[PDB]
Amino acid sequence: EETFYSVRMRASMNGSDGGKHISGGERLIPFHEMKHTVNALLEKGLSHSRGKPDFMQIQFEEVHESIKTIQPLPVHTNEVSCPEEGQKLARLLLEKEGVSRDVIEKAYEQIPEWSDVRGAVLFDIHTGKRMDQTKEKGVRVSRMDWPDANFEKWALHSHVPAHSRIKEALALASKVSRHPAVVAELCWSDDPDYITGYVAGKKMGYQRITAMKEYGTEEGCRVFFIDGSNDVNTYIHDLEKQPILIEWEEDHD
Amino acid sequence: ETFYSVRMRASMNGSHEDGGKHISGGERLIPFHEMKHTVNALLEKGLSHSRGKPDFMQIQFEEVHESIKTIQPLPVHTNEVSCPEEGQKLARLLLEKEGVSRDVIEKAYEQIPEWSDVRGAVLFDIHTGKRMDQTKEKGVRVSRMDWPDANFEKWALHSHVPAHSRIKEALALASKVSRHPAVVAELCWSDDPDYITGYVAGKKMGYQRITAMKEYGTEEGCRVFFIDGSNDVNTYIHDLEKQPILIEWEED
Ligand SMILES: Nc1ncnc2c1ncn2[C@@H]1O[C@H](COP(=O)(O)OP(=O)(O)NP(=O)(O)O)[C@@H](O)[C@H]1O
Ligand SMILES: Nc1ncnc2c1ncn2[C@@H]1O[C@H](COP(=O)(O)OP(=O)(O)NP(=O)(O)O)[C@@H](O)[C@H]1O
Ligand SMILES: O=C(O)CCCCCC(=O)O
Ligand SMILES: O=C(O)CCCCCC(=O)O
Ligand SMILES: [Mg+2]
Ligand SMILES: [Mg+2]
Ligand SMILES: [Mg+2]
Ligand SMILES: [Mg+2]
Numbered sequence: 001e002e003t004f005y006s007v008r009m010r011a012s013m014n015g016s017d018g019g020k021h022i023s024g025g026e027r028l029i030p031f032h033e034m035k036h037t038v039n040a041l042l043e044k045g046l047s048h049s050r051g052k053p054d055f056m057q058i059q060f061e062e063v064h065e066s067i068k069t070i071q072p073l074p075v076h077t078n079e080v081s082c083p084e085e086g087q088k089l090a091r092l093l094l095e096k097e098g099v100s101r102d103v104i105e106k107a108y109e110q111i112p113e114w115s116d117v118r119g120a121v122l123f124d125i126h127t128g129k130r131m132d133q134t135k136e137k138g139v140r141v142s143r144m145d146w147p148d149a150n151f152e153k154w155a156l157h158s159h160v161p162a163h164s165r166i167k168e169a170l171a172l173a174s175k176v177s178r179h180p181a182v183v184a185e186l187c188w189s190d191d192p193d194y195i196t197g198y199v200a201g202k203k204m205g206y207q208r209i210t211a212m213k214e215y216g217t218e219e220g221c222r223v224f225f226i227d228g229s230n231d232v233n234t235y236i237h238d239l240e241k242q243p244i245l246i247e248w249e250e251d252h253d
Numbered sequence: 254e255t256f257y258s259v260r261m262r263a264s265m266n267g268s269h270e271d272g273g274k275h276i277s278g279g280e281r282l283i284p285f286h287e288m289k290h291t292v293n294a295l296l297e298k299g300l301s302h303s304r305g306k307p308d309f310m311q312i313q314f315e316e317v318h319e320s321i322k323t324i325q326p327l328p329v330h331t332n333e334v335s336c337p338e339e340g341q342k343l344a345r346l347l348l349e350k351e352g353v354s355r356d357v358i359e360k361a362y363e364q365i366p367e368w369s370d371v372r373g374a375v376l377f378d379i380h381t382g383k384r385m386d387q388t389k390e391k392g393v394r395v396s397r398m399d400w401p402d403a404n405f406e407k408w409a410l411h412s413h414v415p416a417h418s419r420i421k422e423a424l425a426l427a428s429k430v431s432r433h434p435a436v437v438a439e440l441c442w443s444d445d446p447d448y449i450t451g452y453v454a455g456k457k458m459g460y461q462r463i464t465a466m467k468e469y470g471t472e473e474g475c476r477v478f479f480i481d482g483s484n485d486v487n488t489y490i491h492d493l494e495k496q497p498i499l500i501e502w503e504e505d
Contacts, residue, residue: 005308016315035296038312042292054257054316058292061268062308 004028004067004243006143007037007060011045011053019055021118023048028067028145028243034060049193050218063143067243072146072174074205075158083195086209090186090199097184097201099225103128111221115190120222122232125183131232138222141239144175146246154248165194173200175244181228181235188212190220197221256282256321256497258397259291259314262372263299263307269390275372275444276307282321282399282497288314303447304472317397321497326428328459329412337449340463344440344453351438351455353479357382365475369444374476376486379437385486392476395493398429400500408502419448427454429498435482435489442466444474451475
């Protein structure tokens with residue numbers, strides 16, 4: 001049983017304090033990867049297209065819970081020609097996954113107000129309302145990662161480019177989708193220079209959508225559509241604390 | 254040309270907040286273009302410590318918005334002693350020379366064992382003869398001071414003192430702290446098992462190094478500031494944490 005470490009970073013400008021969120025990252029690693037990983041997070045925060053931070057934290061801590069290893073979701077890339085086509089597709093896919101249309105519309109009305117949320121919003125498909133009480137902080141999924149070497153192999157097989165963005169997103173989405181209360185996830189970047197997003201779920205897998213907004217805009221989105229009776233805090237604790245490594249099995253081909 | 258405060262702390266068996274053992278701490282004050290090197294120096298300092306390997310560490314940077322003040326290091330004298338009991342006695346003599354009363358010194362020495370787990374400094378009020386800050390195990394952590402290596406190395410050459418980073422860090426801290434008009438004296442020795450030199454610092458005597466202050470292999474250090482002031486302790490804590498200082502020595 002190898003010991004793993006959670007390594008987290010966040011960065012902002014104009015303070016920590018009301019600042020603009022610039023970058024966030026999370027990694028899960030053995031101890032001999034610490035120097036490289038702390039540097040990868042530092043650099044990710046310092047070279048961000050949302051601007052240069054005046055505040056950054058980086059932390060590591062031993063994880064005591066035993067690590068679980070899962071397969072990435074099956075990926076499909078939907079090529080679209082503009083953001084409106086993408087968004088419409090996204091809403092079709094959410095519906096097919098099981099989110100009712102009226103819940104989807106209600107959430108889409110609120111997505112603009114959630115632009116500044118630094119993690120994810122949790123949206124209850126029973127009440128048709130936001131379920132977490134974290135406000136601008138959002139719920140930040142942590143303690144997931146995907147050893148690069150296995151990711152590069154996966155991307156080669158999948159005919160998807162071996163970009164860090166995709167490794168991070170797919171690791172997140174896979175951890176999130178595994179959770180029995182999560183029906184679906186809608187995501188696109190708050191970076192001005194990346195317009196691909198996705199909808200994920202247990203059935204459809206990870207459905208990339210190649211245009212979800214316009215170049216140059218900084219309004220991203222991360223919403224988890226939740227179907228659960230249980231207390232939201234239990235779900236939040238799972239998302240924040242349950243350690244996941246992604247390992248794609250070439251062999252299962 | 255804006256400066257950044259870069260701070261680190263590390264502990265084992267948890268964060269310090271959960272009751273982990275403090276391993277290492279550091280603070281630097283740097284232009285933005287030195288950030289990578291500095292974050293790497295702090296990471297490495299935390300990971301290679303003689304008190305053991307951390308399982309928790311935080312590193313943070315923020316822009317400093319107060320103006321930087323540049324000062325001289327204190328004058329340094331090295332007192333050679335044969336053993337830790339001789340050094341401790343000398344330290345008490347020097348605290349008294351610096352203006353601390355014997356009764357306050359004894360009361361502090363009674364409490365020093367209690368403060369072994371404090372990760373920063375204890376503030377000791379000479380008017381009450383008791384601890385003054387309410388930070389408990391966190392202590393007060395002096396930050397936002399630093400000393401460009403090139404100038405420090407010149408200083409160490411001139412001073413016939415080795416150019417060790419421990420000394421640079423300590424003398425930078427002690428100079429910032431002694432400048433504060435409400436600090437009468439500082440008493441220090443290391444919590445590192447493999448370093449037994451400590452010091453007493455003040456405005457009259459400068460930085461008085463004492464070559465043995467404890468036994469090799471012990472992990473009980475000490476950092477106490479003796480306070481004689483008219484203000485509330487929160488103001489002094491804010492001064493020590495926030496006032497940015499660079500050391501620049503120039504010969505006489
Ligand atoms: N670990 C996470 N948990 C919850 N939501 C997140 C997480 N990472 C990103 N998000 C959300 O999804 C949006 C887009 O993600 P992303 O573009 O990766 O931003 P980021 O991870 O905050 N910083 P960066 O990856 O440096 O661009 C973010 O603005 C958050 O709202
Ligand atoms: N910046 C500071 N402010 C207040 N107290 C400090 C400061 N740095 C160290 N001390 C205290 O003085 C003791 C010895 O100093 P030192 O040996 O430098 O410890 P350190 O800075 O915490 N870690 P390291 O420097 O990596 O050994 C520490 O155990 C602290 O209690
Ligand atoms: O990392 C980002 O910028 C936000 C999520 C986008 C990743 C989607 C992908 O290319 O599959
Ligand atoms: O860094 C430490 O371990 C504390 C040492 C304080 C004395 C340094 C010196 O003057 O030798
Ligand atoms: Mg990200
Ligand atoms: Mg982003
Ligand atoms: Mg130190
Ligand atoms: Mg020490």
